[model samples]
Target chain A: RALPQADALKERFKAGSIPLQTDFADLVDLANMGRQAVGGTEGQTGPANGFTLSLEGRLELKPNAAKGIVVDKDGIAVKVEASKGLQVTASGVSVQAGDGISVAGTGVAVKVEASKGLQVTSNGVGLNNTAWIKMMCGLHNATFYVSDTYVCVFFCNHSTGCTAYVYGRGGYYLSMYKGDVKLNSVDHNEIISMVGSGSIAAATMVSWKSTKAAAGISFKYLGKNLITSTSHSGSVTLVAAP
Target chain B: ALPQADALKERFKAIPLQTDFADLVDLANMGRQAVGGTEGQTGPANGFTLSLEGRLELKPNAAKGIVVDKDGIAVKVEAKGLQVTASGVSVQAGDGISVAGGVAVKVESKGLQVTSNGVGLNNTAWIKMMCGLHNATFYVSDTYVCVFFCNHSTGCTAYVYGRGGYYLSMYKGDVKLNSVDHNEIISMVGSGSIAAATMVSWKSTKAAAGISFKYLGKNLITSTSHSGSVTLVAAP
Candidate 1:
């Protein structure tokens, strides 16, 4: 026969019969017990080492105090603080604005250089040179002459002009119009003689004739008076007055 | 009954293992007591606080969750449903990618400057500023004032071809002073005389118009050889 049972054992094992143990060790299962266990390996020991509490949602650190945030990579750091401004440095860089880029400064507003040249275009006037402008017109046979304070250009039809006087007293006149040229002057020189192919108005000549035996020798003067001789002479004589 | 109880008590006392039985009862009572009588500083409490000597890592979880790294702290989160909302965004090391938006998206900076071999300013369909093309220029030197386009020679060639075969010109201003050597004018409306050879027509509002007048001195006239008909008519 079994020994007499204790009657308290019947109610002690019933669910909700005894209040649940509300202690840390009482709540944890044996498998996860090491995480909070003081004597177990690799877990929380005390509050002096600080606490890492993982939770969802945004976190605010040191909300009532002044503490800076430093973003660092390699040895370079970006320190952000409530009092200081943002500062940056680099080997090379850029800062771009979509609407426009405005810069206010003293010296040169902008400077640009290119392999060829710079161009500026708009709907307005193209260029203005302060010194002066030149208008060069081209013409044939254009010749120029200069002086101390003035210069002139001349275009001429006659290359050489009035070099020598015609007939020593009268000037030769050259007329040119519509591609026609005329050279005209007066016979006014005292010592110059004139020649013509028409009938002679006056003439002077030295005359002599001999052939074979002087059988037909004669002289005619002014187309009327005649003189005849049958003998030839080695010397001839002219009577100035007879 | 009283006498039987007496005899049992006497018999329990008379047993030689009575001290061992008492020691066993004390050992069981000690096991029931708390490890530390009043809960020591290092023992488990209501909630445990854990710390790390070096880094703190929040590793990924199998379930979907949002793991975030909040202010002034370094943390990495691998999550499928992570979302970030900020006042402003800046990229330091790479290109910026912008998604299509309903309204205009603006990027602002202090200043924007570019440096390169060339810069093109293209505006609308009308104007484009380009480099490396010839341009018209007006220049002046100590000796000359030059106007050139399409490089000087070509411009001058066109001008000559247009004005060929015309020997005399009439100009308006004191242009004779600055432009005399470069130009040939038959009748100039300035202080100048002309040679008979170059005089085809003369009209001066200044009342100083004639050809070969000796009273007109240097620079008042330009002289050249003349052999042409002379019309000398003086009305009485």
Candidate 2:
């Protein structure tokens, strides 16, 4: 922090008089405009020009040594280094890294080190699916249409959350688990044991007659088509389809 | 870097007796003042002004530079190029600085801070990147769901990963999905699918890669730096 020697001319600029621009600093100002005069014993302000620069040295502006208004050199980082990292603040906040932005906690429980790409580890993955979401595999081409970003997937979690990974391009596979059971066991190719739930929330399409016997079987898709037929429990002549 | 003031002393060397001077009040009535006078801290500006040749330059010694102040906050420029007040910032030479849409687009350490509203306030796009690899970003204003598209010189690359229900709207370019953990996508190529599996395992022998497909996404993607062989996954 330094004082401002910004008076019109050193000797406190006294408008009009022979003692007008008489100070040596004033004479220097006068001479700068291609004219000359000498000094006075009484020079109001000191010099009003120039600077000093060293790598470790600084040229800061502040009211005191600690408060930083601006700094040209903050130690080994010989640039305008701000004590606080900032740039824009309007709309939303954004941070970019030339290499990678790793948000890691040494506590060593949950960490997301996204150097190669986004490597996240967390409790589990909960996809925010809006309606039907079709996700494409790595390096593959597909127009996945959900309600969110097309050509994209969303959800960021770390320090113990998901089982999803990306871009290895070999097996774009995921082993999904809801509880201790593996949800990945089922596929669109085959049918599995029947699964039932109490009146589904956000829905009420299914209803069965009073205490009915168990069918113990469920249904699935065979490439967007259903492949189930009647097994003749009534007086019906059931035969194979043409 | 002007010559020292020592050289000019000889010019003002030959002096007369204690010189006579004119009174400012006497000159005030004549209205011939180039700069007005000050009474205590109060002052008035006369119609008079002083203009000079463009040769005026401040030749100060050491770090004694100009300090342009108003109120109490000052923009002082000394040994280095420094300015601003209260909340401010800096920029140095070598690692230069640049700006695009004012605050919206400013050059930071090694990257850019592209704020959502980092563009103009008047009208049109907050940000419209109609430049190289022309592209446009839009979404259902219904919910601010963005459907981004692009055109690159070579094959383009698009990806999906994050904290929402992201759908990769892939019409052109190679596709990618960056998953960190719990979340997973059963990816399918042109034929079909994000085929889920109970477990997956593989090994790359004396070959170029492991689980190799017709590589179409990022130039090259890998999880480990391969410090060694045999990295383990948590046992169920």
Candidate 3:
């Protein structure tokens, strides 16, 4: 029914309206939970500069499969640039970048060149390389295979191509202990890691023994074996023959 | 020529004993041509002798010489009775025995009492030579055997040679006393069972101070080192 109140309201509105209706401010519609409260949702902004999201109860971002953060692609590649003290930890998977992180490759044959200055405390580094994987941490804990047979673990500067000069004041070096480590120079000043379960052939121009200066070498009689650890330096007491 | 005894004193030159005896001995006397004596030839003309003032060489033959004992004890000459007196007491068979006709001629002591200076047989007397098939033994109780180096690989109490260039006193210890120079000496010695020698040297470990010895053919019972040092009885 067209009441006089409606007619009067329309006439006032056309005449520049008596006043635009104010959003309900004083009404406390408690029965119908808040639709759009004032000052926006609480805790959406920062306390001052840095903001922190906390939980008072069981809080979850994903309510249903459709609302989950979706990230689907061929593969994931991340570049990390860290300082000497930057530490990153993740259970899923993470690649840290630092001054020592190097990536050089074309297309599918990407190679990772890891050097010192990067302090990575990882369970393990699973390397999938097309050509070769060069790790210059002075210490490496990696498992490798040849012809699909488990070969060895440990990392060393085996290539004459590798020109690694490790010198630091950290008392020791990054030690790679695994399979046979062929060192071009046995004199690793700072980064000192040893390859176990294999022989370390010395550089022809050096005075150090081509093998371990102390115990020499240890090799598996069989093939496709895995070595968990290796020591290159430290007080390795060698007993004399009885 | 000068009232000489025509007794060809063939310039008694001290030559290496290794040289052929025929070239060294006075050949005119009995054709001193070291005649190849038969295996068992024993007769007065069968044996010969080389007499020198200090030393003599007795070429003994089997059939010619009759030795009462292998040690050349009392022997009966064909016609004459030759007597040899001992300058030193304790006259043993080989002790200064007279080599008559290549055989040791024993003497009649003529009731002369024998007195010894040292132990009875322990006297530091030495004799050395190359004996034939005939054997001789000395009974020096408790005395060790002494040998001189031989070419037959048999052990030697001592050895001197031009090649070895060393004096090996291989007693209880195989001590090798080297010779600075090599030497080849002749006229070695042979006691009853032992043989001592001195030889020339191409070089000696100790010049004039080394133990020089020649090679002796015979061997002793075993190797021995005498308590008393070796006294070069005679050398030519």
Candidate 4:
């Protein structure tokens, strides 16, 4: 409708009834935005001076599902945000901060890249990595399994008639309480200490002994490590002599 | 007026032309833009070839962006200058390299877990833990379970404890003291430079110049020795 009005204004100018300045002004509004000042339902173009260009909202170029801003010119770039806590800035590109800057990522989490150094100033910090917790705790007691080839520490009350097996390729330091302790076959890399009275056995013999009856015992089987002490009180003697 | 129509015709003739039975030339140009070229630009896409199997390569001088070649990926900066900076580079699933010089380099979180032959530390270099405790050192090397610490004005103490009552402690000082408890009883106190170790067998005795060691009850030796002394006493 405004273009038709401009057509009428053009005819009036052609008829020499309207002045040139008024005719240009009459067509300028129609030429720019027609009847409604807004250009499109979604986008509007503001008045432009030959020197200055600006965008009111987002200026989208390519029509695609993917969303991001791309700049064609290879030079310094700057992004500004009207409201704080709602924008992100990339490196080499200047960024005007808002309320605060929040950086986040999925896999690596947060990473700060700078030339001199990086520092985190905070009241306190916490680590959620379970591996970190385990690493800092240093050493703790656990069951050690002992076999001809495998080795580990077994946790159990020795006085509860619990049986502890001892045999391994590498030397093991073992401390135990009272119980039925059995040394089926001792290996070179084995150290056994019993604090309570217990039954001990090795090879094909077994005997009840108080390990504390003596300080300790050190014995080498083949070329292995060490072992110790024995005591028993039994009223039995087998002797057949003529 | 139809000025230079024949010259225009000659210019059109210079443009090498071909016809595709399925395409109108104008429509083909538009379709080419729709399918391949970006921003109405056309050129031979020679630098990279994305196969049906999806392997990519870069032509000698035509590399751009990231190129996954025979070996792996290389992010090549074109002839035009640019700077690329990254916060860090990770190896596998572990923290690899970090730019913050003070950030820790850890394997399983312990500062020094290097399987390498030896690690050297410069002046005032240290190995610190996350809990804020630090053990300053100069050099450390580990080969099986043996770890060696060297080069300290006031040396460091080493402690190791494993299964089967195995415990050891040794302090490094001008007057060093070491004790290996359990099965094979051993104790030494001295300035490793010079010292005398003596054993005595008696009810209770003291030596004027050497260590006084007395055995009481079932195999219990109480002795105190420092500096340098050697004494041997036997039963009558």
Candidate 5:
């Protein structure tokens, strides 16, 4: 109806009539919507502007039903470029790289919550004092399995040949509720009491009996006739047995 | 002629009048728009080329407006929400989680997270520890159990308790005290009853040291070595 109106006005113009703004205005409307040349519905011309099919709704370009979005073209180069980088917030994320994933930073680089369990297979572990891989409750963390509730401590970067010493800080004592004790070895086993020899002995006010033979009861060194009532600068009588 | 009307006349004339198809007719290419549906050859011969002023935006009614699928993959949207894929898609944070110079956390599920390396730590010194109370150390395995305890005032003491009694028990070097004073080392052994075991104390001082025994069920009947020393006394 709009373009036919243009036809009506065209004839009037041929008869030497001046054009009305209404005429040009109607054509503009037709151009804004599309026309037959663009394969749009004719008359009132279904929406288009140059290469664009203007719409208030949507435009779907699905090539087929069998295939969604496939990039099989070898010539196609894909890249994602964003200024602030990509950010994604989700309930859970899974990253699976067949090779490996390397995470590094200044301090406390990589931390994972493995309250359940964590397992890993790697070539080797490297720690430069601060650089460490922290673990908690891992089944395959070591040669021995640590269940889902164990956290381990480790240290790195030291020369060598250092002795292991146990030091206590508080004003208290070190106790081993129950344990065996020994001074290792310097020579044959013996118990030597270092005090002023002959100052105190199992003599003066003795009461116990000697039930064993003095065979392997070795007490040499400071027993060099100096520090006990059992040794001599003088002769002491043994009321029990030698 | 009216110039504005003439201009409009020429514009309508150039349109080839929709009747030209109803007129000259595509006759041949009318079939071509389908013969190839425009691409590689005729090259956009159907639609008007986009002028610089015109912009083409693809807005969709559905969630994912555009999905590029050939036969393999690359995509966006829901389910996993805006995901991309190649071999194994990697989701990363450029400026930490929320702020710059923060922490770029790599989140992963239990299954894929196992792909990560094992957890470990680094220690500095002798793994030092501070105790608010007394101290203790333990070394226990199968055959042996040993522990050492420190008494706040009496210094340190060690003991080893064994099931069948330790063989030769633990070896001792020797007993050495700095400043001399009175001290005692008690030894006890029992086989059947309390009476069957012998109990003795090797008591010592700076000069005169002696031994004492407590006989079972014995009450002191008489005494010796008074004042000048400790008298002997016990039960029957």
Candidate 6:
């Protein structure tokens, strides 16, 4: 009646019963079949995107306090935090001030004070007491002075070129103290018509008018900006215009 | 008026009636009136003037042909046969006759011939005239010759036209020796003395400079009269 039963049918065929078609098969065969039908399936395949095959999942910590961490599968986590007492912290990591991930902290400030005849600090400190902070100026050249104290206290480049002579008519009293005077480069007759080249050549300021005065000597340049006094007693003076 | 006067008066005015005639009767009255007469085309109002109103007879001068009533200003010469004899002095143009004094000189042509008696010292005569307004001169004919025939001296000269320095001659002691041919002549003889004088002959020539003489030769006979050098030119 319902067609002989599957058992009865198989008994008749003489081969032992048909193997039950379950999902259990050699994976290779299953893959091959999948390949024939849907092309590929063992895993996804595409262009080489340099994707990594991560073996483990990452973990991150959510925090309500001053620090946090984001950990990769290897247990390496990036920590970000601000700490007191010259350090910072995140999770369990720590860094001290004045090093990587640190800077000079707040409440630790530096200051400098200067004098009329001498500067209070040197290069970032007091006068040249180290090899880094050396001396520049001297006497016996054209120098303007309050004379009781400082030389050049602090120099700031507030201009484009050495335009000292233009600001000279004002109260900005610029002076020279070294045997070498600072020559006017781009702004003086050095760039103008008369004395066509950079600074006065040596034959200049060799005369009596340049020799006697402590304040009127002209700036001469050997290698251009190397301003210096003449071979004789030389100096310069500048009386600021009233 | 008297009839005798009336007859004469009317007879005078009968020919014509003139505005200047007052009346015929007054014409012949011959009474005095103030009248003025003046010279018209005539020379002087007197028409002509005469002196002495008579004839004159002259006598010769043991001196000069006597001049009568000289009036101290005027000299009178009359034409007697019109032959004028000026004794001891007659003005004739020779070589050196003194012609310095003649009032109204009568210049005769060289037709005048003066012959010498003999060549002597001052015995030779000639003329020297001071001209008035006229340039006075004399003449000589070609044969106008004067000769001196005796030479006892070596150097002397005979002069001609003495005063105005017109012409002159010089002879060396006559025997017809050397004679001057120029308008001015001089003597240079120093021996034998040009003891003879001669006459100066000339055809009128132009006037010139001061001419003179100097002794040149040996002993001279006699020198001529000192005729004037030359007339200095007078400028007006």
Second chain TM-score per prediction? 0.16, 0.21, 0.16, 0.18, 0.21, 0.15
Ranking by lDDT: 4, 5, 3, 6, 2, 1
Highest lDDT among the candidates is held by which one?
Answer: 4
Off by over 4 Å in 5: A1-242, B1-236
Docking outcome class, model 5:
incorrect
Candidate number with the higher lDDT (2 or 4): 4
* lDDT (C-alpha, whole model) for all candidates: 0.20, 0.21, 0.23, 0.24, 0.23, 0.22
lDDT of 2 by residue, B1-236 (tens): 22234533333465412211112122221211112222232222431122222211222122432232222112243434233334443322222223222111233312122223221111112122111112322111111111222213322222222112112222221222121111222222211332212111111111111212111211011121111121111111
Fnat across every predicted model, in order: 0.02, 0.04, 0.00, 0.00, 0.02, 0.00
Q: Per-residue lDDT tens digits of candidate 5, residues A135-239?
A: 210211321111110111111112321111111111111121111111111121212221111232111010112122122221111111111123111111111
Which stretches of candidate 4 lie above 4 Å from their native place? A1-4, A13-189, A192-242, B1-144, B147-236
Q: Which scores better on TM-score, 1 or 2?
A: 2
Interface RMSD of the candidates, in order: 23.8, 18.1, 67.0, 20.5, 15.0, 91.2
lDDT of 2 by residue, A79-135 (tens): 112432223334422222112122124321212121111122355212223211212
Q: How would you encode candidate 6's per-residue C-alpha lDDT over B1-236 as one tens digit per residue?
A: 22232232343431324532333223222111101111222211111121253211222121111232444211222221112243521222221222344311111111122234421212211211111101122222112232121111122212222223212234332212222332212222223433211222222222222222221221222343432221212211
What class would a CAPRI assessor give candidate 6's docking? incorrect
Estimate candidate 3's alpha-carbon lDDT, on a 0 to 1 scale: 0.23
For model 2 chain B, the run of ten residues with the poorest summed lDDT? B138-147
| Model 3 CAPRI quality | incorrect
Candidate 4's residue-wise lDDT over A1-242, tens digit each? 22223234445444335346655564443333311221232343321111112264322222111111222365211222222112234542222221112233321122221111122235321232232222211221212222222222221112211112233334422222222232222222222332223433221111112121111222122212235343221121111100
Model 1 spans > 4 angstroms off: A1-24, A28-242, B1-88, B91-132, B135-236
lDDT, candidate 2, at B80: 45
